[PDB]
Amino acid sequence: SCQAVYTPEDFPIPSWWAANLPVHVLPLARYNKFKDSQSADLPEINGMTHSIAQGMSEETFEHLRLEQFSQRLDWLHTADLGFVGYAAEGGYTNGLIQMVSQWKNMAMVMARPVENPGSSGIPNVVYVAYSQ
Amino acid sequence: CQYKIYPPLGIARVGNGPAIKPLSLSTPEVPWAHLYDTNVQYLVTQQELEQLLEEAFGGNVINEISQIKTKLDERKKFKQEEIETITGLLGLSHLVPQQQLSRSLDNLDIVQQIKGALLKVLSDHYLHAVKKQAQNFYIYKCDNPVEKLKLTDGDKVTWRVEVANKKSFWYDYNNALDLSLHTQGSGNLSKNVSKHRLAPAMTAKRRNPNVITNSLRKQLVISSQGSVSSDNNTQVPLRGKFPAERHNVLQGSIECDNEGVLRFYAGNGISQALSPSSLNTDFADNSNWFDDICDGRVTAVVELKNGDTFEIQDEQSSAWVATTPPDYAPQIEPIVTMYDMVSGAALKEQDLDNLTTQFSDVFPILYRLYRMQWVNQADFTDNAVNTQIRELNSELGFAQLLDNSASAKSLREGIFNQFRNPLFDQDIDVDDNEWVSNSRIIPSKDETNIAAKPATSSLKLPFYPNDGIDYPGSPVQWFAIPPFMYQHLQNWAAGDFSVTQVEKESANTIEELGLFYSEQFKNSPNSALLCARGALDALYGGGFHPGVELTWPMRHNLIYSQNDYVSSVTPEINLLGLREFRLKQDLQGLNSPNMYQDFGHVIAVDNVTASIDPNSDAAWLWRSTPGDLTKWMGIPWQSDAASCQAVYTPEDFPIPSWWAANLPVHVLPLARYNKFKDSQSADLPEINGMTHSIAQGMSEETFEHLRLEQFSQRLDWLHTADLGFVGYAAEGGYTNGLIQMVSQWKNMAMVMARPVENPGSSGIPNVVYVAYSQADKD
Amino acid sequence: NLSKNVSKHRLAPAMTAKRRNPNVITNSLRKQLVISSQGSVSSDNNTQVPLRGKFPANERHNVLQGSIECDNEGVLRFYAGNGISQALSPSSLNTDFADNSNWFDDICDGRVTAVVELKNG
Amino acid sequence: ERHNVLQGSIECDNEGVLRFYAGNGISQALSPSSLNTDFADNSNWFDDICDGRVTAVVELKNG
Ligand SMILES: [Mg+2]
């Protein structure tokens, strides 16, 4: 029950207690797609093949990092709270019901480093949501 | 062979905007005509309402008002008679009810607050309204269409249209019956699906099953008809009844201009149950409901001054028309379209190795998939092919994809290998024969607390569901581009394709070649065949569960009386070609003896099988009568549009989406647009939602960063209006979405191209596509 | 039991039917959905023997499918289960008259054989 | 938008008796989707129940 409370106006989205029960989080999936720099010595860089990552201009590389960083995921979607599967109802009530079992699977936010933000605008410390 | 109508299958889309030309849209007659037109207005604007009212106020009107006030001051409010006469010379009775026009003035530079009062009446009814997308039909002379009919004085064309809606009469939609139909395979569907039982067709019961006997079931069909011709431009409504208290159903409106062009408008998008308590909780099959969707027969008679009359009404020369849901992103083309289904329908699967390929044949696949980033999150931030295209654009390197030589082969294969094979025989493990995908499945909502089997194979593209969604572990759960399009991609990958040099010289970026290909369409001389293709290129061609506009009968050549390749778009650039095709028609139309045919208590794949023989008691299924094309779709259509969104998996990304190109899933709200469209140099008191002081006081690098963060915030399309999720302790949910959509379809966000004048180094493109609604503007 | 006319005149056509518990894929995994057990009793001892299985089969739930005993006269008496039905998760509700995923019950059926051993060998 | 509500009908007979009829029993929500699931309190609903003031004036032949 402790999440967003939508108004007829889309923004800003009101939230109850986001600091302890977050509402929009930065998932590990996105962290793994901005944490690297273009020079990284990895066969995969930010979810791209080495060659594609280093083939693009530095402008477009950092841009891609920032877009990934900007993707926030509804915290209620970090576990199956009744919205998963074809034709699923989801909804407020199923959230309440499913949270009894799924509370232990919800995303847990932890500080994580970005060693070389370069020009991208991503701070050296980011706060990342870890779930399955 | 004298005269023929075009397009052979017109499309008009419902909307609550008025059925007048200045406030309507026109179905595309040339593909790719306005893909970057940043001036489009798909919602009725304040400005259009003002100039609609201005043109109605051109004297006579004004001094005939001067003279009414000469009789207003020898009395010194209005009179019932002078009221209903300023109305009537303005001629707005066809737009808004007359007594609200009247009541608007009775409750009251004389000029001004007559307009001020009526403009607020128009605004209240039509401001931000979804404009109707109307279809123009044209008479072409042939002998092979030469050019549009030339109406000299003495001549006249008389159009006839008969339409019906049989949704309430027909059968449930569970899944596509042809999934089990025995076949050799076509260009649209591989024989593997039926051969290996990958998505077996389900039986389906009657909708509204409590209405019994065929004669009482005829009340469930809405039908209407009308005629117009060159000598009168009066619009005539196609009004039926449901059932046939009883409610009037405006199925559409027809009008013909002095030069003989028929314009077809669809209904206003009004769906309704016979009782308020009947809720539309299922995605397709809801008893007690009707909607104003229709489809029917289009014929004409040309009568010359010479006394020579030409009846246009055989299936070779007549046309059809179908109304559909609105197109909420008209510039965003579906990856596989209805036109592509027409093209594949005439092909045989195992003869696909004889197909020949140009780059312009594979270009639409990558182009469409690339542009899906404006309506679907996965294709914005989770599509490695779209990212690689960005990488190539970044270095002006897109032209390498047009290189058919060995040196580019590894580059072409890496893209092609990410695409799902419509043979549906990859990423599977045979169970003994059952084919079980070893890639990512889309589970049923009926869950079972037993650990899922780990996928061993990556999920292929595109990331959309498909006709077999009902079957966890079927490869047909996910969408694949159809066999003939996949054959083009296979040939491209191997190098078996050609391309002109001038194509290579406009291919530095995908956007550059897209414009080149668009102007190829526009400068193509075959306007009749271009208009035929334009009518279907914006429609969806899969998956069909049941789809958005039309569904699975269209991907079979049996439903066309003729379907022939005619030529390339340009003498040397195919661009998937131009075809001549007509639907099979019952020439008796609404008086057909098969107008109310069915298969008894259920329809099944066995009925579809029997219908193959052109001489069976089931072959009527393919000889369409009015209402036959849309009867398969969900009733009311809003229930199916509201279930046309994301289908989430246990894995968060990518988020699968059914048909994002026409019913968007993740969009860029106007609210964000107003927060990145400005440059730091702008001199307004608010720049990108910031005070002038704050915006200009930050480093330019930080300014650009804020632009792109805004640009990157994509909103759930279901959230652009109140679909039951708004308010403290609101339930939201799937079902409330279907219910609310009945009235909220007309408030959902409409995506329109918009310009970014000076994006600087922000990384935001010069043309963006922005979703407009009342909730997402600020 | 059933006249020809029902099928011949399509009075109540059969419907297609999907798999129960459809998210469990592959025959090997679907074997876990079957609960089975067996047992043997003889006339030399009347001690009752439970027919106890497990769902899912190889947290798992013990399912008593029945109990069997044999008296000294050679009569086998077969008892059914206790009536215990259950879902793998408490939130899984059995809202369809017949098809509810994530549920198991203790109903069963199976094979009854025997061996007779006379004193002469 | 906006619905007519027949709250009742009145009539007087030549002998001066006033006869008050009630409404037709029409209840309705401002939108079909608004369902009256609570026994007393349902928003967006109206009915044609009423109650009010009953007055009269007696005017004789002598004025
Ligand atoms: Mg579109």
Short mmCIF file of C-alpha atoms in Angstrom, two decimals, chain A residues 1 4-13 16-17 27-30 33 38 46-49 51-74 76-95 98 102 118-122 131-132, chain B residues 174 283 377 380-384 387-388 390-392 394-395 442-447 469-470 545 643 647-653 655 658 669 671-672 701 704-706 708-716 719-722 725-736 761-764 773-778:
data_model
loop_
_atom_site.label_atom_id
_atom_site.label_comp_id
_atom_site.label_asym_id
_atom_site.label_seq_id
_atom_site.Cartn_x
_atom_site.Cartn_y
_atom_site.Cartn_z
CA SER A 1 0.00 0.00 0.00
CA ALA A 4 2.51 5.92 -5.49
CA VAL A 5 -0.81 7.79 -5.28
CA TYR A 6 -1.67 8.97 -8.77
CA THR A 7 -3.38 12.30 -9.43
CA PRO A 8 -5.28 13.10 -12.64
CA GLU A 9 -2.21 15.19 -13.57
CA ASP A 10 0.60 12.85 -14.59
CA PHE A 11 3.48 14.67 -12.91
CA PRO A 12 4.73 14.91 -10.28
CA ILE A 13 3.84 11.35 -9.21
CA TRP A 16 4.24 7.85 0.36
CA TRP A 17 7.54 6.70 1.90
CA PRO A 27 17.88 -1.51 -11.41
CA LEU A 28 21.05 -3.53 -11.71
CA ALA A 29 20.06 -4.05 -15.37
CA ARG A 30 20.69 -0.37 -16.06
CA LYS A 33 24.65 -0.63 -19.05
CA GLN A 38 34.54 3.26 -23.61
CA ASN A 46 27.61 -1.45 -21.13
CA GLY A 47 25.62 -4.32 -22.71
CA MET A 48 27.24 -3.84 -26.17
CA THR A 49 29.90 -5.89 -27.92
CA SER A 51 33.50 -3.50 -31.19
CA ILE A 52 30.18 -1.63 -31.24
CA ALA A 53 30.94 0.11 -27.97
CA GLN A 54 34.29 1.35 -29.27
CA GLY A 55 33.08 1.96 -32.82
CA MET A 56 30.68 4.73 -31.84
CA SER A 57 31.74 8.29 -31.10
CA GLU A 58 32.43 9.30 -27.50
CA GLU A 59 29.50 11.75 -27.65
CA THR A 60 27.04 8.98 -28.48
CA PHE A 61 28.65 6.57 -26.00
CA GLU A 62 28.20 8.85 -23.00
CA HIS A 63 24.70 9.77 -24.21
CA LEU A 64 23.80 6.09 -24.18
CA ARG A 65 25.12 5.81 -20.61
CA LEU A 66 22.98 8.75 -19.47
CA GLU A 67 19.81 7.35 -21.11
CA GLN A 68 20.36 4.02 -19.37
CA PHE A 69 20.98 5.82 -16.06
CA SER A 70 17.72 7.70 -16.61
CA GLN A 71 15.58 4.50 -16.76
CA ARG A 72 13.77 4.03 -13.48
CA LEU A 73 11.71 0.92 -12.79
CA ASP A 74 8.62 0.78 -10.63
CA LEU A 76 6.51 -2.95 -7.37
CA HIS A 77 7.76 -4.53 -10.60
CA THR A 78 11.00 -5.88 -9.09
CA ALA A 79 9.14 -9.04 -8.09
CA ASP A 80 5.99 -10.85 -9.27
CA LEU A 81 3.22 -8.96 -7.45
CA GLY A 82 0.47 -10.34 -9.69
CA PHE A 83 1.27 -8.55 -12.98
CA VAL A 84 3.39 -11.33 -14.58
CA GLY A 85 2.07 -13.55 -17.35
CA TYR A 86 -0.40 -13.28 -20.23
CA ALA A 87 -3.66 -11.59 -19.17
CA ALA A 88 -2.42 -10.96 -15.61
CA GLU A 89 -4.67 -8.66 -13.57
CA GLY A 90 -1.95 -7.00 -11.51
CA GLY A 91 -3.53 -4.09 -9.68
CA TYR A 92 -3.39 -2.71 -6.17
CA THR A 93 -5.11 -5.63 -4.39
CA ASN A 94 -2.93 -8.38 -5.88
CA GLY A 95 0.09 -6.34 -4.78
CA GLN A 98 1.44 -11.16 -3.19
CA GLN A 102 7.25 -11.47 -2.37
CA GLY A 118 33.82 10.88 -17.98
CA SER A 119 31.53 13.50 -19.50
CA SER A 120 28.31 11.46 -19.13
CA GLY A 121 26.91 13.24 -16.05
CA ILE A 122 26.65 10.06 -13.98
CA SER A 131 16.55 -8.12 -7.41
CA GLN A 132 16.08 -11.30 -9.46
CA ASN B 174 -9.69 -17.36 -28.54
CA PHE B 283 -10.33 -8.74 -24.06
CA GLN B 377 10.84 1.01 -24.13
CA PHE B 380 14.72 2.44 -26.96
CA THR B 381 17.08 0.96 -24.35
CA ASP B 382 17.04 -2.84 -24.79
CA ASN B 383 17.43 -3.49 -28.51
CA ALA B 384 20.99 -4.31 -29.47
CA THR B 387 21.85 0.46 -30.57
CA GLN B 388 24.18 -0.81 -33.27
CA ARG B 390 22.89 4.24 -33.57
CA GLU B 391 26.57 3.35 -33.41
CA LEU B 392 26.72 3.32 -37.24
CA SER B 394 27.20 8.14 -35.03
CA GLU B 395 30.14 7.61 -37.44
CA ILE B 442 5.92 -15.86 -21.50
CA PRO B 443 4.11 -17.65 -18.60
CA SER B 444 0.43 -17.96 -18.03
CA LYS B 445 -0.99 -15.73 -15.29
CA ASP B 446 -2.11 -19.10 -13.75
CA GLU B 447 1.04 -19.69 -11.77
CA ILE B 469 0.77 -16.48 -26.69
CA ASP B 470 -1.62 -18.94 -24.98
CA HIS B 545 -4.64 -12.37 -31.01
CA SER B 643 -5.47 -5.42 -23.54
CA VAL B 647 2.89 -8.68 -21.36
CA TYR B 648 5.35 -8.88 -18.50
CA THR B 649 7.71 -11.78 -17.84
CA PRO B 650 9.42 -12.79 -14.59
CA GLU B 651 12.47 -11.14 -16.17
CA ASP B 652 12.09 -7.37 -16.10
CA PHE B 653 13.71 -6.50 -19.44
CA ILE B 655 9.27 -5.59 -21.64
CA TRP B 658 1.82 -6.51 -28.48
CA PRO B 669 4.87 12.97 -22.88
CA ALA B 671 5.43 17.30 -20.21
CA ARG B 672 8.96 16.05 -20.90
CA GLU B 701 27.30 20.41 -20.10
CA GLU B 704 22.51 19.28 -21.92
CA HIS B 705 22.51 16.41 -19.42
CA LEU B 706 19.20 17.64 -17.96
CA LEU B 708 18.58 14.10 -22.21
CA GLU B 709 17.39 12.84 -18.77
CA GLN B 710 14.05 14.46 -19.53
CA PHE B 711 14.07 12.97 -23.04
CA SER B 712 14.72 9.54 -21.54
CA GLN B 713 11.67 9.50 -19.24
CA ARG B 714 9.10 7.31 -20.95
CA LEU B 715 5.57 6.99 -19.53
CA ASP B 716 3.15 4.01 -19.62
CA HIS B 719 -1.26 6.22 -17.70
CA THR B 720 -1.99 9.10 -20.13
CA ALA B 721 -5.62 9.08 -18.98
CA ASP B 722 -7.54 7.82 -15.99
CA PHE B 725 -5.57 3.77 -11.39
CA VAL B 726 -6.11 7.38 -10.15
CA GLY B 727 -6.94 8.39 -6.56
CA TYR B 728 -6.11 7.27 -3.05
CA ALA B 729 -6.41 3.45 -2.78
CA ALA B 730 -7.30 3.14 -6.45
CA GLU B 731 -7.29 -0.46 -7.72
CA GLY B 732 -5.93 0.14 -11.22
CA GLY B 733 -5.34 -3.24 -12.82
CA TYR B 734 -5.93 -4.94 -16.15
CA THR B 735 -9.73 -5.21 -15.94
CA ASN B 736 -10.39 -1.64 -14.83
CA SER B 761 25.35 18.30 -28.10
CA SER B 762 22.48 16.91 -26.00
CA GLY B 763 22.05 13.78 -28.08
CA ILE B 764 18.38 14.51 -28.72
CA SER B 773 -3.04 14.14 -23.76
CA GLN B 774 -4.62 16.30 -21.07
CA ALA B 775 -2.85 14.55 -18.15
CA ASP B 776 0.72 14.46 -19.57
CA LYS B 777 1.08 18.10 -20.70
CA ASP B 778 2.58 19.35 -17.40
#
